[PDB]
Write a protein that binds this ligand. Sequence first.
Ligand SMILES: [Zn+2]
Length: 83
Amino acid sequence: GSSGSSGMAVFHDEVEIEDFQYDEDSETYFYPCPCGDNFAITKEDLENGEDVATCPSCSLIIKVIYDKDQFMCGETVSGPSSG
Ligand SMILES: [Zn+2]
């Protein structure tokens, strides 16, 4: 019948990107998973406002604490001629 809520936000731990390991090679961050495989989150995903790293093993999801301003600042349209 009426299911209601669809899905449940269950994270393992909120880690700051500062701890993650950015790899220019594939512009993708990494993190040590308590299961085995190291998490992975494409820089793009972050900019889009994801802040979630999935594991190719357990598929765990953690909260990536990063400066939204840092990622955001870049594509922001140009009006007053910022610079
Ligand atoms: Zn894992």
